[PDB]
Design a protein around this ligand. Sequence first.
Ligand SMILES: CC[C@H]1OC(=O)[C@H](C)[C@@H](O[C@H]2C[C@@](C)(OC)[C@@H](O)[C@H](C)O2)[C@H](C)[C@@H](O[C@@H]2O[C@H](C)C[C@H](N(C)C)[C@H]2O)[C@](C)(OC)C[C@@H](C)C(=O)[C@H](C)[C@@H](O)[C@]1(C)O
Ligand SMILES: CC[C@H]1OC(=O)[C@H](C)[C@@H](O[C@H]2C[C@@](C)(OC)[C@@H](O)[C@H](C)O2)[C@H](C)[C@@H](O[C@@H]2O[C@H](C)C[C@H](N(C)C)[C@H]2O)[C@](C)(OC)C[C@@H](C)C(=O)[C@H](C)[C@@H](O)[C@]1(C)O
Lengths: 182, 185
Amino acid sequence: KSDDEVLEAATVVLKRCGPIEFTLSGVAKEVGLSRAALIQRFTNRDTLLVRMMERGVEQVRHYLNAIPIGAGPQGLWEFLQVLVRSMNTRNDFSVNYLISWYELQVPELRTLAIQTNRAVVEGIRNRLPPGAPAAAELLLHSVITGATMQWAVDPDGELADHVLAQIAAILCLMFPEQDDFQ
Amino acid sequence: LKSDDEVLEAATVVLKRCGPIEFTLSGVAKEVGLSRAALIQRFTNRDTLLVRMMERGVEQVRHYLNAIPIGAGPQGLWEFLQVLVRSMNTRNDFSVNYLISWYELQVPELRTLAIQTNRAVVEGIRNRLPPGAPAAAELLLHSVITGATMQWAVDPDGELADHVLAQIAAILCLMFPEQDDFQLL
Ligand SMILES: CC[C@H]1OC(=O)[C@H](C)[C@@H](O[C@H]2C[C@@](C)(OC)[C@@H](O)[C@H](C)O2)[C@H](C)[C@@H](O[C@@H]2O[C@H](C)C[C@H](N(C)C)[C@H]2O)[C@](C)(OC)C[C@@H](C)C(=O)[C@H](C)[C@@H](O)[C@]1(C)O
Ligand SMILES: CC[C@H]1OC(=O)[C@H](C)[C@@H](O[C@H]2C[C@@](C)(OC)[C@@H](O)[C@H](C)O2)[C@H](C)[C@@H](O[C@@H]2O[C@H](C)C[C@H](N(C)C)[C@H]2O)[C@](C)(OC)C[C@@H](C)C(=O)[C@H](C)[C@@H](O)[C@]1(C)O
């Protein structure tokens, strides 16, 4: 078992037990090792969460760089569709808001939450066609963020359908010289 | 000595201070100045007190939104949104809002009230849309406020309201091109 593989296993545990009940003992039974082994490789649960979020930042950047780039506003629309539809709601999605809140209470994790968000914002900024409004990347990131929490509180249909309806609405406003976003 | 509404107010202080997980009747008792037994006599237990708190919250949101001065056209919308955004006090227990929200989604009786609460904000925004505003504009505007606020909460720079209203002005400018400029005031 490699350090990377146990970090992925820990991600499973975090999304299942939440950050409060996240423990080395739980990560061990998941990946199939001992607590003493994890304390040797990661010291404590706080450092394991740090290493997990560090890998998360790299994984965000890797995933955003992988999505093909189409032409113009339509390519931006295509990019946002893939990004949003990637959010898995097969299981309880609300645990991720506890993870977020918890991370912001721990300074080193808060820094990594910042880097995670800046990576997504930068990924969107680099896909902006010419002529897009200033700081358009921030407004688009806010729509995804806000519309997702909207649905998380008051779910109606699929998460992606709720979010992308609003993304299409604001893209139509940003790029009125286009036909339409469907 | 201390009315039910006074109890709900003190309980809200405890909730914002301690969060929904460490929230206890003993804490509310200490804050409001009644015995825990008196609170049990009147609210049964901590969970039921939380429900009553969120029921009151739904009415308070609607009354607050209704009371914001009523203006005309896109400018009236812009003015209403400025007041709504500036009402969030980031120096009075703000991060706890996100733990409260998560918690509410775990308790069905509370989640129903969180849904009513968000729907009251969306409808209050809809009630200030001028004729000719895009369909579903209220949901988009609510998402920008909600999303820009969490954006700032994670990665703050400057004041929350300036961060959020910069994006509201930008989207309003796109919603109403005929309009002149959406400036702060
Ligand atoms: C709280 C609310 C926020 O939710 C979260 O933090 C989730 C729980 C993430 O998973 C967390 C947990 C995690 C294990 O992903 C499941 C971790 O990898 C990721 C960094 O953050 C997501 C699902 C990430 O997507 C995932 O990013 C991965 C790099 C690859 C995944 N997929 C294989 C292509 C992809 O779906 C994503 C980048 O958010 C940042 C999605 C992107 C649209 C956003 O930035 C969103 C606006 C989010 O900030 C959010 C909805 O506001
Ligand atoms: C998760 C993040 C979200 O936070 C919450 O939902 C909290 C958990 C709320 O407290 C919940 C729980 C509650 C007990 O308050 C703490 C309850 O009273 C309230 C109705 O909703 C808020 C703080 C409410 O404000 C409160 O509204 C009250 C009418 C008066 C309060 N104060 C005296 C000026 C004021 O702070 C408010 C109406 O949101 C809906 C703020 C309004 C600007 C929004 O809609 C925001 C976009 C929010 O949705 C949010 C930032 O996205």
